[PDB]
């Protein structure tokens, strides 16, 4: 009732603050922060947003304070420091909580954060060059909300233990983004080391039927074929943008595996840049994500995807990705370019096969 730099989400129950000091609790107020416990591991100059694993740990602390009998008639204030970067990580993480847990809509969570001074720092990429592309909290909120509507995110089925385990470099460094796709880093072969053995065991027990390699050969692809997984090379230079013919081949190859009910595992060297282009183009093709929503959703699961000029590339080609749903269709004949899978052909060539 007397605070400064505090935003109201729910009247007398939920508040978002930002202070350069530790506020004292009151008979009607209780304050808590997670800056000291839940932080963002930065690649270079990227600072956020927080990932889904950070969201889950925030919900446990939030729910514990909510149902604490001593806080029965208190208003909870979630706060951070006054830096524009840390104020964006807290506000966006609080918005994604109301979207995925309390079933709020985008315009409901964005109303308290609009036209605030000082404004939040927009999120940047994880590359080394100077930033020239930004996504906002409005982009991430709409991306997380759209993914939930399409059944791509379910916090009830979220396993925090396995999420943190398999994200480490020692366990393979991967994140299952959707029920159809997995993004990982290129395995390495000098028996077999633990990260490679962990990837083979996970793929064999999770219905992975296709592995797409996007970087130079760092291992023997026979290990995937020995356990019954098709291997495919769509390699292009690290940090570059894929040709649209490579993107078209990837979509048709993934749609074939999706039809069979399996998953596709894509990797470059780090599983962020080149991997984000192809998987990002398919998500826009399938569910109609905007370019900014798609980048925000991928970083919410696996931070650092789509790097540098790939951000502007995904932005200027998002119309072509959503166009293939109406101008193309899966071919009835396999193609040698995608290892026997069925690619994309226009309707003109497709209706000719229909009879002929």
């Amino acid at each position: 009732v007397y605070l400064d730099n505090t935003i109201e989400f729910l009247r007398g129950r939920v508040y978002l603050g930002a202070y350069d000091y530790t506020p004292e609790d009151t008979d009607e107020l209780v304050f808590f922060t997670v800056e000291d416990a839940i932080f963002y591991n930065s690649f270079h100059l990227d600072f956020g947003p927080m990932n889904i694993g950070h969201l889950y740990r925030f919900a446990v602390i939030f729910h514990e304070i909510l149902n604490d009998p001593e806080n029965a008639n208190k208003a909870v204030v979630f706060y951070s420091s006054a830096s524009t970067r840390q104020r964006a990580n807290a506000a966006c993480m609080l918005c994604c909580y109301m979207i995925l847990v309390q079933a709020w809509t985008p315009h409901q969570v964005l109303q308290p954060l609009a036209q605030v001074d000082p404004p939040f720092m927009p999120f940047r990429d994880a590359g080394y060059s100077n930033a020239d592309f930004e996504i906002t909290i409005q982009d991430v909120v709409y991306g997380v909300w759209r993914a939930k509507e399409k059944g791509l995110i379910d916090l009830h089925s979220f396993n925090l233990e396995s999420y943190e385990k398999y994200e480490h470099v020692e366990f393979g460094d991967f994140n299952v983004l959707t029920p159809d796709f997995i993004a990982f880093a290129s395995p390495q072969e000098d028996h077999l080391n633990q990260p490679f053995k962990s990837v083979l065991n996970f793929f064999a027990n999770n219905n992975v039927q296709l592995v797409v390699r996007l970087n130079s050969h760092l291992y023997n692809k026979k290990h995937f074929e020995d356990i019954g997984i098709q291997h495919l090379d769509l390699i292009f230079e690290d940090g570059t943008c894929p040709d649209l013919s490579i993107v078209k081949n990837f979509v048709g190859a993934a749609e074939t595996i999706i039809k069979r009910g399996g998953k596709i595992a894509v990797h470059c060297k780090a599983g962020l840049g080149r991997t984000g282009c192809l998987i990002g183009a398919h998500l826009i093709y399938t569910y109609g994500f905007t370019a900014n929503e798609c980048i925000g959703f991928l970083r919410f699961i696996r931070p650092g995807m789509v790097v540098g000029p790939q951000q502007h590339w995904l932005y200027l080609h998002q119309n072509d990705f959503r166009e293939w749903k109406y101008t193309t269709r899966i071919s009835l004949k396999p193609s040698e370019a995608i290892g026997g899978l069925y690619p994309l052909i226009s309707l003109e060539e497709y209706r000719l096969q229909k009879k002929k």
Binding site: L10, R13, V14, H63, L66, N67, M98, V101, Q102, A103, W104, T105, Q108
Partner: peptide
Amino acid sequence: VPALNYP
């Protein structure tokens, strides 16, 4: 899960 639905 606390009831924090939008009014």
